[PDB]
Amino acid sequence: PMPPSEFLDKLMGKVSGYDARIRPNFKGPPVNVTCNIFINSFGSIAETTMDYRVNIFLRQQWNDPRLAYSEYPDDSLDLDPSMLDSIWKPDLFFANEKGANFHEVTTDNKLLRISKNGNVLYSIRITLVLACPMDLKNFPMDVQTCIMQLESFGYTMNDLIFEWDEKGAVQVADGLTLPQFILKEEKDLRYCTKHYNTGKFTCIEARFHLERQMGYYLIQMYIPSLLIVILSWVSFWINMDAAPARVGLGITTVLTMTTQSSGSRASLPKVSYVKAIDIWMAVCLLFVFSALLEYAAVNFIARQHEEMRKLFISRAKRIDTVSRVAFPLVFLIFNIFYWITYKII
Amino acid sequence: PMPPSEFLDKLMGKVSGYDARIRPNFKGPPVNVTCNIFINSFGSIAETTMDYRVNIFLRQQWNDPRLAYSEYPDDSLDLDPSMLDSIWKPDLFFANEKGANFHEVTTDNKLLRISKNGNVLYSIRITLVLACPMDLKNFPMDVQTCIMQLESFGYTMNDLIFEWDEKGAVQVADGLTLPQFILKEEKDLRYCTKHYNTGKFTCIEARFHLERQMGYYLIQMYIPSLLIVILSWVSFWINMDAAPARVGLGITTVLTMTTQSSGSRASLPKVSYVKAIDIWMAVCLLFVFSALLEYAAVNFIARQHEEMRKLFISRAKRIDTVSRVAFPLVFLIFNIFYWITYKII
Amino acid sequence: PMPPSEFLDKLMGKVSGYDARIRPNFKGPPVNVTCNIFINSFGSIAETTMDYRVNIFLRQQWNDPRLAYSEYPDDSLDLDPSMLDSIWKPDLFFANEKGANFHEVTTDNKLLRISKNGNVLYSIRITLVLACPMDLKNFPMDVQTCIMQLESFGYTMNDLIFEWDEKGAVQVADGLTLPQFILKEEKDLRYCTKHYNTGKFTCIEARFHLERQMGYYLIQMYIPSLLIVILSWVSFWINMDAAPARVGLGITTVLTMTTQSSGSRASLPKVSYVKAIDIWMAVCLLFVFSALLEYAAVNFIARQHEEMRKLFISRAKRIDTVSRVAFPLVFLIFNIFYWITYKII
Amino acid sequence: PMPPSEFLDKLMGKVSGYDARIRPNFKGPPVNVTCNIFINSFGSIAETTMDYRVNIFLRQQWNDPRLAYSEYPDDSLDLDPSMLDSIWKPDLFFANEKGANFHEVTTDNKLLRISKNGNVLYSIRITLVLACPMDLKNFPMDVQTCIMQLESFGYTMNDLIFEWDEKGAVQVADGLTLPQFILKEEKDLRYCTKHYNTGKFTCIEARFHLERQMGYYLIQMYIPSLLIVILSWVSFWINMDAAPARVGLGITTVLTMTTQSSGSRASLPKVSYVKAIDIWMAVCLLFVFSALLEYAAVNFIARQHEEMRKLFISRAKRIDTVSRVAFPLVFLIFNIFYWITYKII
Amino acid sequence: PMPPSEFLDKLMGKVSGYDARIRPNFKGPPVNVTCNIFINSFGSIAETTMDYRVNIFLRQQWNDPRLAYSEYPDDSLDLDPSMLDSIWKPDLFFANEKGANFHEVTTDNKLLRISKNGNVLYSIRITLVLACPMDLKNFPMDVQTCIMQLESFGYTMNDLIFEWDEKGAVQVADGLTLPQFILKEEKDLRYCTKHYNTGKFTCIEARFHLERQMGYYLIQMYIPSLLIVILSWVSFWINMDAAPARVGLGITTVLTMTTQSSGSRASLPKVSYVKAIDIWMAVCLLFVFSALLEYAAVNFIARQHEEMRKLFISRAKRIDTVSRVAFPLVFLIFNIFYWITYKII
Ligand SMILES: *[C@@H]1O[C@H](CO)[C@@H](O[C@@H]2O[C@H](CO)[C@@H](O)[C@H](O)[C@H]2NC(C)=O)[C@H](O)[C@H]1NC(C)=O
Ligand SMILES: *[C@@H]1O[C@H](CO)[C@@H](O[C@@H]2O[C@H](CO)[C@@H](O)[C@H](O)[C@H]2NC(C)=O)[C@H](O)[C@H]1NC(C)=O
Ligand SMILES: *[C@@H]1O[C@H](CO)[C@@H](O[C@@H]2O[C@H](CO)[C@@H](O)[C@H](O)[C@H]2NC(C)=O)[C@H](O)[C@H]1NC(C)=O
Ligand SMILES: *[C@@H]1O[C@H](CO)[C@@H](O[C@@H]2O[C@H](CO)[C@@H](O)[C@H](O)[C@H]2NC(C)=O)[C@H](O)[C@H]1NC(C)=O
Ligand SMILES: *[C@@H]1O[C@H](CO)[C@@H](O[C@@H]2O[C@H](CO)[C@@H](O)[C@H](O)[C@H]2NC(C)=O)[C@H](O)[C@H]1NC(C)=O
Structure with missing residues (x-):
């Protein structure tokens, strides 16, 4: 029938009243955003600056009942990254960014899929310059631990909740080396749940254990x-x-x-x-x-x-x-x- | 009733005449903006360049009687960061920036809340490359003091006045280390009140005492x-x-x-x-x-x-x-x- | 007759229904994008960062039956780079970018040609900061191999397939030197065909053999x-x-x-x-x-x-x-x- | 009466025909732009690159008879920096920039005031990476002189003339130190008046004498x-x-x-x-x-x-x-x- | 009579059909663009990276019969840099850029003049990071030669031809020094005429001879x-x-x-x-x-x-x-x- 780009403009336009500034399940239960990352590159662990840069994929999955469809026959869609500003997206950020950026080479490296029941898959590509404090008391014989934590920014605990998915929460690319360290295959996964004078903001983190050669x-x-x-x-x-x-x-x-x-x-x-x-x-x-x-x-x-x-x-x-x-x-x-x-x- | 994004377009639109280029209480008393910061990261105190970079939150609170509402039932709102250009915001800047930038990863890291009486909370996330002059006369035995001052730019003293709030004016993140210095838990807070040939511009500052190991x-x-x-x-x-x-x-x-x-x-x-x-x-x-x-x-x-x-x-x-x-x-x-x-x- | 810029607005406008968000041959066979690169500059192979930067041309050829024309007499056209957003382009990216950018000096360095039957030539100019893991076990007597791989991002295997063309898949500029290495004239060409939990994404790669002096x-x-x-x-x-x-x-x-x-x-x-x-x-x-x-x-x-x-x-x-x-x-x-x-x- | 933001839209709009692409006093006498700077930061005088960076305020004053008003009662106005593109501004640039940028933290750091008779004050904040050639013949015993010159770009001598004001043409911030040099309190001020094959372009400069410790x-x-x-x-x-x-x-x-x-x-x-x-x-x-x-x-x-x-x-x-x-x-x-x-x- | 900014909107608007996407003399002789540069700064000749940065003016002159005028009395005009996108400009680029950028301080540093017969002068200001391969066989006793070549990108030989003008093709600023080299006053000027599998693209180059102290x-x-x-x-x-x-x-x-x-x-x-x-x-x-x-x-x-x-x-x-x-x-x-x-x- 009609092409999917015109079917999404019917689904997200001024018809059907989908406003991209209101989260799904408004004035109800919070949104259960689940996340997993995929580390492409990793390294340049500077110690004067006490940071390290990492190049990840960031996959986010949530549910949005306003985007449920049944008339169009195919079981999945894909929104073009030009029309991406007409979708509610979580305001995920990293609590220790210290500078970061996207990649915009030949296309925005942004993926969006909409399932039939309303599940939304959103995958982007980020270079981070994450900061981890290091303890060089015993310098050749040390085990460094550099965390990576993902807060929410605007939505509090009662509106938006992050989760690690129970199926491969952190994958690492295969042939990945480091000049000075080795990366153990033990990724801790724990909550942190930041408090401020503003409110309870959710956050999840992943610890990486580094062992110096x-x-x-x-x-x-x-x-x-x-x-x-x-x-x-x-x-x-x-x-x-x-x-x-x-x-x-x-x-x-x-x-x-x-x-x-x-x-x-x-x-x-x-x-x-x-x-x-x-x-x-x-x-x-x-x-x-x-x-x-x-x-x-x-x-x-x-x-x-x-x-x-x-x-x-x-x-x-x-x-x-x-x-x-x-x-x-x-x-x-x-x-x-x-x-x-x-x-x- | 109606969603909050449509309620703010009624409140800020061409209806009710809210112009974002006129400060509140116009031709009257000045605006009492109160501020407090939250230091996430801190370090790389270069001494050839004589600067240091810091990664802060910047919370600003002021009153705006044009944004007072009573019809909508909830006690607080939140403006989306896309619609953020339709609000009067103070033109705060740092008198010793030496370069700075925001963070725009997955969302603008900008928060805006509007209370019922018209109090406005505005919180952003900035990386600064602040400059402090250093005195290396006695190099291992030195105590460095690096200030952080927040002027206004366009509005003079009779229009806009900065204040440190009386409830935790500077918080520092918990596990924060430095490669060479230690950061004392003594934050001075004083006014500076810059004069030019343009006018009296308000400014507040916060001193940090650094003790070299x-x-x-x-x-x-x-x-x-x-x-x-x-x-x-x-x-x-x-x-x-x-x-x-x-x-x-x-x-x-x-x-x-x-x-x-x-x-x-x-x-x-x-x-x-x-x-x-x-x-x-x-x-x-x-x-x-x-x-x-x-x-x-x-x-x-x-x-x-x-x-x-x-x-x-x-x-x-x-x-x-x-x-x-x-x-x-x-x-x-x-x-x-x-x-x-x-x-x- | 009519100038080519007005003839393409008839061909790509709301008349004839060319939507730039739908790939050619939709709900049919996949798109056979063929590629070849041209290396202008090459070098600064850092080993602390384990990367190298390269300055390439990127020529892409595919077929698009919606862009076939017969009324206009000339055998080829050229779209201006200002009007370039009204053409379906493949979302090619490099799987080990680690940062990259275009060049926008005096004009976007972007070329687009449309043949009469509908073949499309698209050539751009990119600076890459590609990352290759290095093995410094035998440091003066080593042979480094630094790959360069080109995944698709949004389209899976059944929609878009990359190919190296069978006529000069990698050319190198003539007078190209390096401070430490020499570049052999043996360019391997092989598929890699990335799998994820998202789908089968196509990728092609080119290996470069480096021999240290x-x-x-x-x-x-x-x-x-x-x-x-x-x-x-x-x-x-x-x-x-x-x-x-x-x-x-x-x-x-x-x-x-x-x-x-x-x-x-x-x-x-x-x-x-x-x-x-x-x-x-x-x-x-x-x-x-x-x-x-x-x-x-x-x-x-x-x-x-x-x-x-x-x-x-x-x-x-x-x-x-x-x-x-x-x-x-x-x-x-x-x-x-x-x-x-x-x-x- | 009416707010100043609406009064300036009457003054600069399509009513009254103020076109921002025509200088004041068109087809008449040239424009007498007068300037003075205020140096906030100064330093990192690199000698391999032969440059130094400086962080200035840049105050410009000229007259514009089209902006004269008498109906509005207050003696001065202030244009918001969002509406700043609807004012003729001089195309001042630095003849030895070697890279520069503005500051856009929390607001564009740009000030514009309009007096009643039509005098216009315009003050911005720039980081320069100015280049000065250095003569290291006698390296510890040297006196460096690094200039700072301000050409016009598009307007020739008969259209636009720069001047140093006769009241504090260069001020320097108070507690300003350098790692290697000292900055004398002797600022020369002279014209340079560049010629090309394009025309006579005005320029003013300010010399800074540096004495190495x-x-x-x-x-x-x-x-x-x-x-x-x-x-x-x-x-x-x-x-x-x-x-x-x-x-x-x-x-x-x-x-x-x-x-x-x-x-x-x-x-x-x-x-x-x-x-x-x-x-x-x-x-x-x-x-x-x-x-x-x-x-x-x-x-x-x-x-x-x-x-x-x-x-x-x-x-x-x-x-x-x-x-x-x-x-x-x-x-x-x-x-x-x-x-x-x-x-x- | 009427101001020049309104006279150019008549000359370039939808009236008179001037389309900025078609070169002058279309389907006829090629365009004879003539060029000359003016080197402001020069240096930081890195040898690990094998590059050097230069800060130039770039003057371009061509003829455009569509811009010929006779009604307006003055012998020359000047288009404002805001309205600069409504003029056909050549897509000149440098074949060994390795990164470059414009300057946008206080105004785009871009100049455009239109003579009465239709000659167009276009002058911009660029910082280049040009790359030259170096031969350090005899390191203190060497003569380096670093080229600077200017290709066309989209237009082939039969459409656009670059030329050095016969009146001062390369000028250098007066007081220009280098930390390690000296710059001879012998600038070679020759054609290079790049071939690809895309077509014959014109290019002109200028050689600089460097003699190490x-x-x-x-x-x-x-x-x-x-x-x-x-x-x-x-x-x-x-x-x-x-x-x-x-x-x-x-x-x-x-x-x-x-x-x-x-x-x-x-x-x-x-x-x-x-x-x-x-x-x-x-x-x-x-x-x-x-x-x-x-x-x-x-x-x-x-x-x-x-x-x-x-x-x-x-x-x-x-x-x-x-x-x-x-x-x-x-x-x-x-x-x-x-x-x-x-x-x-
Ligand atoms: C998101 O997840 C939370 C917890 O997993 C859900 O909140 C609970 O939902 C069940 C049944 O709806 C209730 O019995 C609980 O009282 C809820 N609260 C807690 C603290 O457990 C929530 O329903 C989920 N929301 C969506 C849209 O899936
Ligand atoms: C902002 O704070 C200032 C001082 O805290 C207030 O200015 C004073 O207000 C009181 C009562 O309104 C007067 O008695 C004083 O004469 C005012 N001036 C000074 C110098 O003290 C001001 O009212 C406050 N403005 C708002 C909107 O809260
Ligand atoms: C793109 O290339 C592929 C393979 O080269 C083509 O797919 C095959 O096409 C032939 C004839 O159309 C069929 O016999 C095969 O069954 C197809 N599949 C495979 C796996 O070989 C495809 O037709 C080409 N598409 C276009 C538009 O050229
Ligand atoms: C800008 O300044 C110049 C010189 O200060 C003025 O040009 C002179 O103006 C006086 C009186 O108008 C004349 O006697 C001179 O012949 C002018 N030229 C020179 C070279 O001195 C100019 O009038 C001023 N323009 C404005 C708008 O103030
Ligand atoms: C641009 O320059 C070229 C060569 O200078 C011109 O091409 C020649 O023009 C003359 C007379 O028009 C002819 O006799 C030649 O046959 C042309 N070709 C060659 C290869 O010499 C061209 O006319 C110029 N175009 C414009 C608009 O000035």
Whole structure:
């Protein structure tokens, strides 16, 4: 019979009185909007800005009894996105947008379908710049959790209620990678139900668990700083009398410990509180620092003054042979207490 | 009875003569607009640009006797954001915007309610890029104060007056963090009342006190530069005669003091005036610098010329044993006078 | 006769009933849209963001029997881009846009031609910010593959079908360069045919193979780190007794191995998993590290204690003459196993 | 009587024939538009891009005899910014915009007042990204001058003439700071009067003098590089025979002179011509370079060959005692000629 | 008589049938559009993105016999930019835009004049982000050529033809500087005449020759790396027996050669192929590398074993006195062959 574009103008026009500024079931029960998203892209998790951008589909389903039809034979319709302003749509927004936009390439990326009984499917495509607060206390060994919450804006709880559908509430695209994190397959789903001095506004959220990878920070920041500490211990096996050899090994080890730490401030984030990589790069500075102060003691005792010249030279060898075993044992005690308290947490 | 969207077109149309270009109470008392904000997001406090961005709600309440109604039974209404251009709204703007924008995702994030007596509630959602001038004289030990002021633009003092409401004038969202600062729970509220050659324009402002965290700059910039100064003092306990050991300890300590300072210019801001971290990294350069000039004196006196060869070698040991105690005492006097004058301020 | 702009208003107006919201061949066979692109610009392949931008022409051809004409004499027409909203156009979009826009400089860069039988040519100009996931396991020796896929949005498989034309489906502009990659002349063309819970949506894609150039990373990151390992081997030819000469060569070689690696973290990407350049810069750290621990053994055996003073000094020369040949042989075995497993892959 | 919004529609409508596309005083004298600006924000003076952004008010005053009224009683009016397109406005633009925009937060930030005799006040709020060419020949000791010029675009000299008003032509906001510069209170005001092949177009400009602060570059780039040169002179007081002590002091001083210069390339701008900080960091490299070549002469003469073994060892001490006094005297002559020629200019 | 705005509505209205969608001289000769540009700003030549932005005026002149008038007395008119959509304008675009925009500050920056015979002048103001491929083979000694080409989009060769006018086709603003390049006063002008599978589209282009300045790269990258090579040669004048002095001079010279190269990777571009600065910083690494391997030979021959102890100590002095003259002669041969092949090219 008549084409669907003319059939919807009969259904939504000034005939039949469909006003797009009044929600369905007016002065009655609230509207049960159900939602599910589909994540196309995900990433660029900035940590100075503390945000991440995501590229989603947003599928919304509700019921509208004013749009029920029976004369037209086909079981479903589709409104063109040009005529989309003549339909009541929920005023969904994201409570932590921090900037967002649509996509308008070659067509508005907006889909609208109307079933026969009046169920309405509405699917759009959004780029979000969502903000999640991050906790970089233990920086390589951290688990970040970045939420994504969907409030209503104008309609309160008694007029409009969001729901996650019980059939795949969050799907993720297949070949999706990240430069630093991995995305677990555990999506929490819970209500939040914001209160203001304006009213009870509904909101639903979805939590994403992010686990930071490790293999880069071991190879270039832990293991090289580990080897600089090992090169401090070889002063305790070099002779006592070789005075240019000991202190030439001394400061040039604390120089390369500073050079290791100074160049690595570009790759690390720029927060103003102490990390767990920063405790490692500061305690490993102290062992190189304490490995020279040992020799400042040995050089002073051996130079100190025949019977007494043999007694002091035997006491200075005693503090050497103690420090060969006892001081690498101290570093292993730190190395145990470090990795326990940053894998339990 | 009739739906609220048709009731507002009777109330705002060409019938009843409501013109949206004339403020309420025209040729009479001024309009008492009262305001309060709600901060969703806050951060990215750039210091090269000297600004910070914030994501707020902006609630405005005023009275409009032309919008008073009694026939419609419900105690409140809500205008749809499409029909929002047919209401007088105040021309509020921020005196230090430096760029801003709305959010138009899935609906204009704009709320309008009309009470029965004519009170109007208007709530929108704005991202600001507000500018605050910063004073980095004492850089780690600083308290920044970044204002947020709300002028009127077209209406003068006798027509429109802003007010902070006496019931929660600034609320902040709960789980809100910052990468470098902490946000105190002390919001000042004061008038500013701008004058121009155009007229008296009202404005209200809200001050935010920011306190910079400390723990990163201690662990990687103060304490490592502190340990380099301690490694200068061990030259005074090494023997006088070990000439490659003293100067090999000398310059390699002033090399790692430069290497500590040179790599840290990326994390620091790029202002062109002297900070308090810059005084520390320059005075601690002088103690490493002065620890070698001591040895340049000792090597010259001991080489200088039997009776006189014993007298000079005893004078050069005198200037060593003085400098073992007196020069670390000088550094503690600087270390007292530094931290006093940057914690009193 | 009559001008073509007035002839198209007769063809597309309310006369003849051409509605731009109904696809051609409605309630019949699907529409066979055929496509080919023309790449003007290409590049800025970011790897933190994992995307690349491209500037294309997008030529679309389909058939529309409602636009067939015979009265007007000329064999082709051209609709002005102002009147472009009165033509059914396919809702093509890119499945990995991540932001895109048109160009509207001096005229909308949009072309539309209508042939006599009803074939329609439609050519536009788009800047894309397409996203491709990258795999930086073997970072200098990698072959990246960045796809470009073109879904439909609103119309399912039974209504609209995309095709690559069989005559030059992807052309590339002539003098097109890249800062880091080279673009092979092998463009794959395959279907993808997306499924959702909404329906079967057609999509076609084109793969681009990118091969990273090598010559920068050899000259400044492999060859200089190669020469630092060679400067470790000259300690095995310097005398055993020259104790300041050996360890002064020792740590100052592991200092310049760290200095080589620390400054190169700015040019490298910032992923959080181990690369192939990172294995090279860590194993070459171990050979410089192991070249000093050899001397810590030699200095301890030779100092260890006449008959036994000759036996130990001959054993310490034995471990030197073994390490002159055997340890550069170990490095060549690593140097073989490295370049084999990163050129086979 | 009647409200001012309806009185202006009588004044600007199709009644009385006010056409907004014809300037006042048509086919007569030119229009004397007078202007003054008010700088709210100022800064982010980039030097790679060679631009600076500024946030101004722009007040324009002209006369329009068609807008003169006498029936309405009040002495001034105000047109709403929605109805602003029905007024002739000058086509002022900035000759070095390089991008700019308005502000449209909560209302267009646009003001229009009409006096009784026909004087029109028009005030808007603009963010500019104005471009000024910079001359970094003498980089810390420079005085930058960044202009701000306001051409007309369509109207020539005989139709429209800009003027600075004689009452506060440029005001600046009170608490306005900059990260690197200071803004002098000397605003030049002069005409520029652009010619083209199109016609004489009027323009007025305002010069701003910027003076770069100094205190950061002294503390971290001049004074530390000054101390490295002083540590070269202590080789001339260390003994001649201590051969590892002299060259160990030699290269480790030219290493820390390179380390000082290499890390400072991030803070400096990236121009491709020689600065004044670059002459300092290159000449101070030569004094450390020449302080070792002195010892290469001393070590060769003293090793050169009893009577002649005493003569050469007395000649090598002669070139030492000359270089103790004469070479720090040469550096002071450079230090005089440097600071004179970069403070006169 | 009647004002010009009403005279153009008679000339362009539905009276006289001027349709703005049909080019002048329809079904006849093509339109001879002539063009010339005026460059206001120029710069920010990025090399990672391989583009540059420019701020131009764009003057277009063509003839339109439908706009010829004789009744109105004045010899020229000017259409207001609001009524600008009622004029046929050429669909000029730039073939390498990569993003562009107009300027709409206080008025659309668009000019239109109509002469009496029908010549039309049209001048607009555009910011371009034009893309030019760059060839950084010889990086400091390069001459870049960045084109600027102006295609037609919809009209083919037989309908519209672009021309450069024979009277000043490209003017440049007077005080125009660049941070790294200089702009020669030699503007090439040639046709390009693009072909597609769509048709012959006209295009004209203008080449700009850019010559990179040199003075920064000499003072801080060539001359300092030159002096490090000179400090290698002083080992050949220091005594053979001073074993800590030679290798302490050895590695600390190859450390500062790496430190010179490592810090300079931030200022250099990030291409992935070998430059000419990279050949210099790698060959100058080899001379410092080869200056130590000489001493590894000398220390091994002199230690090798009375008659034979005199013969080897005289052979090791022979290889020293050869290397004092012969090896700085080798570096000058490289220094000749380097600067010849990078100034001929
Ligand atoms: C939307 O969902 C809510 C809850 O799922 C429904 O509200 C309840 O509906 C049942 C039967 O109509 C009543 O027994 C309850 O009293 C209602 N309230 C609550 C709090 O449970 C509501 O009917 C649904 N509305 C529509 C249009 O489906
Ligand atoms: C808006 O607030 C101001 C001050 O709160 C009111 O102005 C005063 O109103 C009282 C009584 O009407 C007078 O006694 C005063 O003379 C007024 N002026 C001042 C400076 O105090 C004003 O009435 C309020 N307007 C509305 C509509 O509420
Ligand atoms: C579009 O292309 C498809 C396939 O190329 C066509 O569909 C087939 O058309 C032939 C003859 O009309 C039939 O025998 C087939 O049964 C059709 N289906 C399939 C799956 O092959 C279709 O006709 C084309 N439509 C137009 C307007 O050209
Ligand atoms: C705008 O200002 C100019 C100059 O200030 C005026 O032009 C002069 O006006 C006086 C008297 O009208 C004449 O004697 C001069 O011959 C005019 N020209 C010059 C070059 O001085 C002009 O009248 C003013 N126009 C308006 C509307 O105020
Ligand atoms: C536009 O310029 C072209 C060439 O300058 C003109 O085309 C030629 O015009 C002359 C005389 O009209 C003919 O002899 C030639 O045969 C034409 N073609 C060529 C290829 O030279 C054209 O006439 C001009 N059109 C207008 C409106 O000026």
